[PDB]
Amino acid sequence: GISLIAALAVDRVIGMENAMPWNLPADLAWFKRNTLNKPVIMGRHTWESIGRPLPGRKNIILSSQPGTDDRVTWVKSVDEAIAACGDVPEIMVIGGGRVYEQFLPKAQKLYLTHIDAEVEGDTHFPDYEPDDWESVFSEFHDADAQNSHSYSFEILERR
Ligand SMILES: Nc1ccc(C(=O)N[C@@H](CCC(=O)O)C(=O)O)cc1
Ligand SMILES: Nc1ccnc(N)n1
Ligand code: NA
């Protein structure tokens, strides 16, 4: 099935013009752990902020314009993105906001990191109804010497 994985501040904020004001290596380990050896679909702006192909994963970039890096797969529509994943057990949609909006109604699983931070952003994760989603996993973590904020990992499966 199709899964979304995202990290959210309060008010569903996921992005802004400048780098996010936090340092959460534990969330990136969580991200890597849950995306490895799966196709990852991302929008062009997410691709540019990552800056490199994510190793160990089939990288699929959505863009209206021709691709600029043959190390990854470039697609011009949501249907082309899905087609490029082939027949696999799980497809990982890793952002950004515009991409999440289009894939959420197709998704069966959400991997959400809830960050205890308030950040004015220009991009938000879509609003979802708890009645449509069962919380199957939830784990809270304090901030520590390596992580600037407290956070919790949650996995939801569509009802
Ligand atoms: N929006 C982002 C998504 C993933 C990453 C990223 O660097 N992920 C690495 C892990 C980063 C690290 O471990 O240093 C990976 O999944 O392989 C960075 C920004
Ligand atoms: N898509 C992303 C980017 C960073 N962190 C998580 N958990 N998901
Ligand atoms: Na899993």
Side-chain angles (χ1 to χ4, degrees), residues 1-16 18-107 109-119 121-128 130 132-158:
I2 292 172
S3 305
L4 277 47
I5 182 161
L8 283 64
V10 303
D11 297 289
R12 291 181 283 103
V13 168
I14 54 173
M16 54 181 283
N18 304 317
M20 301 306 288
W22 60 57
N23 188 6
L24 296 175
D27 165 76
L28 291 195
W30 163 267
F31 172 89
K32 177 186 305 189
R33 187 151 40 247
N34 283 291
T35 57
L36 193 67
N37 297 311
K38 309 175 192 174
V40 291
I41 295 170
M42 73 194 81
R44 200 245 313 165
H45 293 310
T46 295
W47 158 250
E48 291 182 0
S49 65
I50 292 175
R52 50 149 184 168
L54 294 173
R57 287 149 280 188
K58 185 171 170 57
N59 288 234
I60 297 160
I61 323 302
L62 272 158
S63 174
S64 68
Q65 301 306 295
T68 51
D69 197 322
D70 285 353
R71 295 178 299 174
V72 298
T73 300
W74 296 83
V75 294
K76 292 185 165 88
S77 71
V78 168
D79 289 334
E80 290 182 8
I82 293 166
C85 295
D87 191 29
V88 296
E90 189 174 12
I91 293 164
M92 303 300 297
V93 182
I94 68 167
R98 186 170 147 189
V99 175
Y100 291 141
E101 291 172 3
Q102 293 167 89
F103 278 94
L104 181 53
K106 305 175 149 53
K109 193 170 188 178
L110 307 177
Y111 301 77
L112 303 181
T113 304
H114 297 290
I115 303 162
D116 294 315
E118 183 169 340
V119 171
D122 57 17
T123 302
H124 306 80
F125 193 78
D127 188 40
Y128 77 85
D132 291 330
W133 295 93
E134 180 193 17
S135 182
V136 306
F137 175 86
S138 181
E139 181 149 56
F140 169 78
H141 296 265
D142 295 332
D144 58 31
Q146 299 82 41
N147 294 274
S148 54
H149 299 80
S150 54
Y151 56 97
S152 74
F153 301 126
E154 180 172 31
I155 298 175
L156 303 102
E157 283 172 20
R158 180 183 287 282

